[PDB]
Amino acid sequence: SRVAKAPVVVPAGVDVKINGQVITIKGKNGELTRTLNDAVEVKHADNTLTFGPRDGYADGWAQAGTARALLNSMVIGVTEGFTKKLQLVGVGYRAAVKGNVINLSLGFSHPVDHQLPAGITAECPTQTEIVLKGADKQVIGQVAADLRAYRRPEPYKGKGVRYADEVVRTKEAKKK
Template sequence: MSRIGKKAVELPSGVTASVSGQSIEVKGPKGVRTFKATDDVDLKVEDNTVSVIPRGKSKRARQQWGMSRTMVANLVTGVTEGFKKELEIQGVGYRAQMQGNTLKLNLGLSHDVDYTAPDGVTVTAPKQTEIVVEGIDEQLVGQVAANIRAWRKPEPYKGKGIRYKGEFVFRKEGKKK
C-alpha cells in the first residue's frame, strides 16, 4: 500500500485543476503545467483536492500510484511557489556573471563557458560566486542546475568547483612525504 498515494493533494486558493482522460492540467499564478498519468491509475478532482486511485492491485499499479500523486503535488507546488536551486562557486578566479540572457562562467578552463538557459527557467547570478536557477518545472530546474554543475564538479582535494548550496564535499588528504 502506498502511504503517499493515499493522501489527496490539496489545491490552494487561486489554483485550479482539470482532468481529461489520463491528463491533468493545473493552472496557478505562476503558469500552467500538465501531467499525463499512466493507465494504471485514475485521477479525480473533487472540491479542492486531487486524488489518485490505483486500478487493480498489480505491482505496477501500486508503483504508479505514489509516483503519480507526487507528480501532481509537484505541479501544484510549481504553479504556486515555483522551484529553486542555488549553486555556489569555490576556487580562485572562478566566477559567474550574467550577460543579457547568457550565464558566463570563468572556471579555470582555457575558454569562458557560455550557458543559455532553456525556456521556462530563469538563471541569475546575484554575486560572482552564486548562481540561482528558478522555474515552475522541478525536473527542468534540477537538470539545468546539474548541467551547470557538470562544467566543474567539486574536487575532493581543494574543494574547488561548482556545488549545490549546502552540499558536503568529502575532502581527501594529499600526498605525504
C-alpha cells in the same frame, strides 16, 4: 502506496484540468501539462486530489505513489516555485549572467556558455553564487546538474560548482 493514500490540498487560485489521463495545472507562474500513467485514475475531488490504481496492474499502487508526488511538486511550483542555489569555489571563477544565457569561466582556455530552457530564470546576486528559479522541480534539478557537471567539485580544495546545501568530502596527500 502509503504516499498515494494522502490527498494533496489544492490552494485557491489554481486551475486543474483532467483531459483523460493528461493533467493541466495553472497557478500564477504558468501552465504545466503532464501525461499520467495509464494504470492510475484521477478525479477532481473538489478541494483535494486523489489517486487510485485501476485493477489489472500489479504495480498500480507504485504508479499512484509516484503520481501523487509529481502532482504535489507541480502544485508547489505553480503556487510558489522552486529555487536552487549554486556556489562557485575557486580563485578566478566568474558566473556572470545576461539575458537567457549563462557565462562561466571555470579555468578553461575558453568561455563556457549555457543556454537555459524556457521557464527558467537565473540571477547572480554575487559573482560566485547563482540562484535559479522555475515552475517545476524536474527542470531546475536537471539544469543545476548540467551546470555542476561543467566542473565537478574535487576533494582537495572543494573547487568547482557545488550545491549550496551539500557537503564535499576532503582529503589530503598522506606523504607525497
